[PDB]
Amino acid sequence: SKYSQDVLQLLYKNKPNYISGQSIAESLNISRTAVKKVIDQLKLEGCKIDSVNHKGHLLQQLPDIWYQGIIDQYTKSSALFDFSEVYDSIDSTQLAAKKSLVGNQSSFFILSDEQTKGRGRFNRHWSSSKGQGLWMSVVLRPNVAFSMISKFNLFIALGIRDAIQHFSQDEVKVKWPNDIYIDNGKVCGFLTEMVANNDGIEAIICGIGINLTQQLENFDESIRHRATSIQLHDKNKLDRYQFLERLLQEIEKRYNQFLTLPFSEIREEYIAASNIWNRTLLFTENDKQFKGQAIDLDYDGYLIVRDEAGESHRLISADIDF
Amino acid sequence: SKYSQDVLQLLYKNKPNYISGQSIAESLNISRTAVKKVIDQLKLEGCKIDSVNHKGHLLQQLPDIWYQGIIDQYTKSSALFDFSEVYDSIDSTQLAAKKSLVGNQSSFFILSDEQTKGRGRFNRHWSSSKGQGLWMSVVLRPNVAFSMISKFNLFIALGIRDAIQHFSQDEVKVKWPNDIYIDNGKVCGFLTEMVANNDGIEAIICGIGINLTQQLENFDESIRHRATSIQLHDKNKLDRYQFLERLLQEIEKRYNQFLTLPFSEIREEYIAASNIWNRTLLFTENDKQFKGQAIDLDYDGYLIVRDEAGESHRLISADIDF
Numbered sequence: 001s002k003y004s005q006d007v008l009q010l011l012y013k014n015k016p017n018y019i020s021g022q023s024i025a026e027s028l029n030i031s032r033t034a035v036k037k038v039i040d041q042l043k044l045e046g047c048k049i050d051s052v053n054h055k056g057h058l059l060q061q062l063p064d065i066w067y068q069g070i071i072d073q074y075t076k077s078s079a080l081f082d083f084s085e086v087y088d089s090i091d092s093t094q095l096a097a098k099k100s101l102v103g104n105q106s107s108f109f110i111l112s113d114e115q116t117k118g119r120g121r122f123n124r125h126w127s128s129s130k131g132q133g134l135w136m137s138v139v140l141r142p143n144v145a146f147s148m149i150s151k152f153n154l155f156i157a158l159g160i161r162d163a164i165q166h167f168s169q170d171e172v173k174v175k176w177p178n179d180i181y182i183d184n185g186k187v188c189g190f191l192t193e194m195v196a197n198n199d200g201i202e203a204i205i206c207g208i209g210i211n212l213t214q215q216l217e218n219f220d221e222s223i224r225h226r227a228t229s230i231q232l233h234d235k236n237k238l239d240r241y242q243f244l245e246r247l248l249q250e251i252e253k254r255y256n257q258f259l260t261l262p263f264s265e266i267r268e269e270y271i272a273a274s275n276i277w278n279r280t281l282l283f284t285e286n287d288k289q290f291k292g293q294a295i296d297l298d299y300d301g302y303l304i305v306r307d308e309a310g311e312s313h314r315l316i317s318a319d320i321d322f
Numbered sequence: 323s324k325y326s327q328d329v330l331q332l333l334y335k336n337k338p339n340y341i342s343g344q345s346i347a348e349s350l351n352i353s354r355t356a357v358k359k360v361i362d363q364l365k366l367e368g369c370k371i372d373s374v375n376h377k378g379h380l381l382q383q384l385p386d387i388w389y390q391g392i393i394d395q396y397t398k399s400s401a402l403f404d405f406s407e408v409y410d411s412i413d414s415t416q417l418a419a420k421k422s423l424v425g426n427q428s429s430f431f432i433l434s435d436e437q438t439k440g441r442g443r444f445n446r447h448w449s450s451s452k453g454q455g456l457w458m459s460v461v462l463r464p465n466v467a468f469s470m471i472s473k474f475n476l477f478i479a480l481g482i483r484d485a486i487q488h489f490s491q492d493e494v495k496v497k498w499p500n501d502i503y504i505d506n507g508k509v510c511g512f513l514t515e516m517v518a519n520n521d522g523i524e525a526i527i528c529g530i531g532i533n534l535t536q537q538l539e540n541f542d543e544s545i546r547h548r549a550t551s552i553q554l555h556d557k558n559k560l561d562r563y564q565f566l567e568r569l570l571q572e573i574e575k576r577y578n579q580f581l582t583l584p585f586s587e588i589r590e591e592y593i594a595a596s597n598i599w600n601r602t603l604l605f606t607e608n609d610k611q612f613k614g615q616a617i618d619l620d621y622d623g624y625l626i627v628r629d630e631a632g633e634s635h636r637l638i639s640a641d642i643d644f
C-alpha cells in the first residue's frame with residue numbers, strides 16, 4: 001500500500017530494537033489492523049521480520065529488492081547526497097540521471113532493480129538482471145575544469161574495488177579505465193560522463209553496474225566465461241544493503257580525495273590494484289585494432305603502451321580486451 | 323484551433339501562389355467554414371494574408387510569433403536538423419534541449435518566444451523578452467573528442483555574426499569567446515555546452531540569444547547602455563523568419579567547416595571580425611580580477627593576453643568586460 005515504505009522506514013530506523021504495531025499506527029495515523037496487513041505483505045515479499053507478542057516487530061533481513069523507504073535513510077544521514085530515486089524497472093539509471101540533473105545543482109543517485117536498456121561504452125549492451133546486481137547512476141557537482149573527468153574516473157575506481165574487496169575472499173583488480181575483475185570474471189563496469197562547457201563541469205554522472213548475486217547459470221552464454229558476481233566469491237550470503245552502504249562510504253572517501261589530491265598520491269595504489277600488466281592486450285580505436293603491452297601509468301593518469309610494432313603511446317582512455 | 327498550424331503550413335508551402343479555402347478544406351478534411359474561421363483567427367493574431375475572390379489566400383507576412391507549422395518546413399528541407407520544438411513561453415530553451423537529447427541521437431533545435439528563466443554564463447540572467455528576440459538552443463552530434471568543444475565555439479561565432487551582418491548596415495563584431503556586438507551594444511550572447519565522456523562527445527548544445535526588435539526603451543536600465551538589437555541597425559523591418567532562415571544556413575556552413583577544417587583556416591577571418599584588440603580588457607576568474615590586452619589568437623584558439631603587470635597568459639576561455 002501507500003504506507004509500505006513508511007512502515008519499512010520505521011522498522012529500519014528502530015533497529016536493533018523492536019517497535020509495536022500500536023506505535024507504528026500512531027506514527028502514521030493509521031489503524032493497527034492496516035499496520036498488520038502492511039507487515040504481512042512485507043513478509044510475503046521476503047522481508048524477515050520477527051513479531052513478538054508484547055514487544056512488536058524487528059526487521060531482521062531485507063530481500064533483494066530496493067526500497068525507497070530504506071534508501072531515504074541512507075540519504076538523510078549522507079552529507080554528500082541530497083536524495084535518491086529508486087525503481088523496480090526502468091530503461092536505464094543513466095538516462096534517468098541525465099534527465100534529473102537538468103535545471104538544478106543537487107547531488108543524488110538513482111538505483112533500479114532491473115534495466116531494460118542498460119548501456120555500457122560505445123552504446124554496447126549492459127546486462128542488468130532483476131534482483132541480481134547493483135545498477136546505479138551517481139550525479140555529483142565538482143567545481144572543476146572539464147579535463148578533470150579522467151582523473152575522477154581513476155579515483156572512483158579505487159572506491160568501487162575497495163567496496164567489492166570487502167566482500168570477496170578472492171583478489172579484486174581494476175582493469176583500466178572502466179572495469180573491475182575477480183580472476184577472469186568482470187564483476188563491475190562503470191562509466192564516467194559529464195555535462196560541461198569551457199567554464200566548468202555542470203555535472204558528473206557515474207554509471208556503476210555490479211554483479212551481486214548471479215550464479216554462472218544466470219549470465220548469457222556469450223559472456224558467461226568472462227563474467228562473475230560478488231556472491232561467487234563470498235562464503236556468506238551477500239547482503240545488498242550492506243554492500244550499498246559500504247559502496248557509498250568509499251565513493252565519498254574517493255570523491256573527497258579527488259577534490260583534494262593530485263593523481264600522483266594514488267598512482268602507486270592504482271598500479272598495485274590493476275590487472276593490465278605483463279600480458280598481451282587488445283586495443284580498439286574506431287578502424288584500427290592492435291596488440292600492446294601496458295608499460296606504465298603516468299602522473300596525469302595516461303596509460304603508457306608499447307604496441308606490437310614497438311611504437312609507444314600515451315592514452316587518456318582505451319578499450320581493452322584480454 | 324487544432325488546425326491552425328496545418329493551415330499555416332499549407333499557406334507557407336504554396337507561396338508565392340494563392341490556395342483556395344476549398345482546396346485547404348480538402349487537404350485537411352474539414353469544412354470550408356472552419357477553414358475561414360481558422361484564417362480569420364490568423365489575421366487577428368497579425369498574419370498578413372491576401373484573400374481574393376475566385377483565387378484564394380496568400381500568406382504575405384508573419385507576425386513576431388514562432389509557429390510550429392512553419393518551423394516544420396525549415397526542418398523538412400534541412401539535411402542537418404531532424405526536427406524542432408517551438409514554444410510560446412518556457413523556462414529555457416537550454417534546459418528543454420538538455421532534456422530532449424537524452425536517449426537519442428537526433429539533431430534538432432528548440433525556439434521559444436519568451437524565456438522565464440534564461441541563463442547565460444556562470445548562472446547569470448539572460449533577458450528574454452516576448453516577441454523581441456531569437457531564443458534558441460541547437461543540439462548537434464559531432465563525432466569528436468571532448469576537447470573540440472572550444473573549437474566548435476569559434477566556428478559557430480563566425481556563423482552567427484555573418485547572419486546578423488546580412489541585416490545590419492553597421493559593423494557586427496565578435497567578442498571572444500561568447501558575444502556579438504554592434505558598436506557598444508551586445509546584440510547576441512551564445513554558449514556552447516556538451517554531454518561527453520573519455521570516448522567522445524554525446525551531444526553539443528549551443529544556446530543562442532539574439533536581440534531582434536527591442537527599442538532602447540525595451541531593455542532594463544541596468545543593461546540599456548551596453549545592449550542593442552538588430553532592428554536598431556536595420557533600415558527595413560527586421561523579419562524574423564527571414565533571419566532564422568539565414569541563421570540556419572550559416573550554422574550549417576560553419577558546422578561543416580568545423581568538422582572538416584583546422585582552426586588555422588578561419589583564424590585570420592576570426593581575428594579580422596573581433597573587437598577585443600587595442601583596448602583595455604577586464605578579466606574575471608573566480609577571486610581574481612585583472613586588466614589586460616589581447617595580443618593574439620593562436621592556431622588552437624587560445625587568447626594570448628598580456629596583463630597589466632606584463633605577464634603573458636594563454637587562455638582557452640575568459641569572461642571579459644570592456
Ligand SMILES: Nc1ncnc2c1ncn2[C@@H]1O[C@H](COP(=O)(O)OCCCCC[C@@H]2SC[C@@H]3NC(=O)N[C@@H]32)[C@@H](O)[C@H]1O
Pocket residue numbers: 092093094095115117118119120121122124125126127128134135136137178179186187188189190191207208209210211223226227228
Ligand atoms: N552484467 C555484466 N557483467 C559482466 N559483463 C557484462 C555484463 N553485461 C555486459 N557485459 C559484457 O561487458 C561489455 C561491457 O561493456 P562496457 O562497454 O565495457 O561497459 C562499462 C559499463 C557500464 C556500466 C553500466 C552501468 S549499469 C548502471 C548504469 N546504467 C547504464 O545504462 N549503464 C551504467 C559488454 O559488451 C559485454 O561484453
Ligand SMILES: Nc1ncnc2c1ncn2[C@@H]1O[C@H](COP(=O)(O)OCCCCC[C@@H]2SC[C@@H]3NC(=O)N[C@@H]32)[C@@H](O)[C@H]1O
Pocket residue numbers: 414415416417437439440441442443444446447448449450456457458459500501508509510511512513529530531532533545548549550
Ligand atoms: N538580452 C540581452 N541583451 C544584451 N545583454 C544582456 C541580455 N540579457 C542579459 N544581458 C547582459 O549580458 C550578460 C550576459 O551573460 P553571458 O553570461 O555573457 O551570456 C551568454 C549567453 C547566453 C545565451 C542565452 C541563450 S538564450 C537561448 C538559450 N537559453 C538560455 O537560457 N540561454 C541561451 C548578463 O549579465 C547581462 O549583463
